[PDB]
Design a protein around this ligand. Sequence first.
Ligand code: NA
Length: 368
Amino acid sequence: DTIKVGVIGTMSGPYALFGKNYKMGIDAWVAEHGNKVAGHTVEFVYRDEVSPNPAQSKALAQELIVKEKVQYLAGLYFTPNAMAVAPLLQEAKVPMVVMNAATSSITEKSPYIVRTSFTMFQNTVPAAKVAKQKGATKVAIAVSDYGPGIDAETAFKKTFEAEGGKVVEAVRMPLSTTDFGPIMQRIKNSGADMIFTFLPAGPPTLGFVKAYIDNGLKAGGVKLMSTGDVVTEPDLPNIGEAGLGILSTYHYAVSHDSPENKAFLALLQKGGAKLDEVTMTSVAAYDGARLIYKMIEATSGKSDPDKAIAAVKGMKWVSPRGEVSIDPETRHITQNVYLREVEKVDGKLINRELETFKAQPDWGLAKQ
Ligand code: NA
């Protein structure tokens, strides 16, 4: 009668907050909705992804399938880890609800993947539109050198150049980069008036932003446009008031002003989470738990991945982030993308949402 769900996330190490947020978001879901579905108890089992390490995530998934007999897998912070698990799913008859990894093609790697996070194209196409609206003419792109960074670079170049913008520099930064000073010097030298950047949220984003400020680019009038990965709320106090004014596009802000988001923050606090630790992976986990409960109801708690996936395709609901749906073609969450600016409101640094771009699909797949 117990159905287990195996959640793989960054539970320890440099990215620990992001995996802790999967547990926070699932705990919030359970605080509201309970742990019973279709006459079964649902139990979430957590395993630690740690870092980009495909073989490790493959092995964790296989252990969860064999030893824990999970009916569903979920989580996956890093793209390469999600890619390692994807080819297992159909033979194992276990769906995977991706709660972060954001490279567009992940959903194409199995019929049994559904994604409740975001894609890089989805958030980057609005960033390029806003860059043009804000008067940028020459942009330097700097992205981490792996799947989602390459998607962000491609999306920004294509969209910005179609708007008449020029990309004057494009740097793919190794994931291991910790000293960002030389990159900042290269950007200065390029004469770009704006930077567009993505790095995975965690130490790389903190380092990049601090170098952008401390090397004087921000005060020198080189504006920063990022995806929201680069300015996650728990790092705003670590950047401090020097981060005021940084622009980003993203599908979720802790400051989102809606009744559903206010209720979600209350549930996070009631499930045991702290507000200044809340990140985007919590909302992807909360919505991913909704989809898992729907799949269990649709299948009466029996393993039947074809019926489970069919039940979530086309589903529409109001998330804490805004109105969302699962596109049946891509199995990716269609959602608003917001333009935000780092602001201080009632003594707190937040990403204030200034503009909405409604109902964005995964632009990386939508024109195929
Ligand atoms: Na597809």
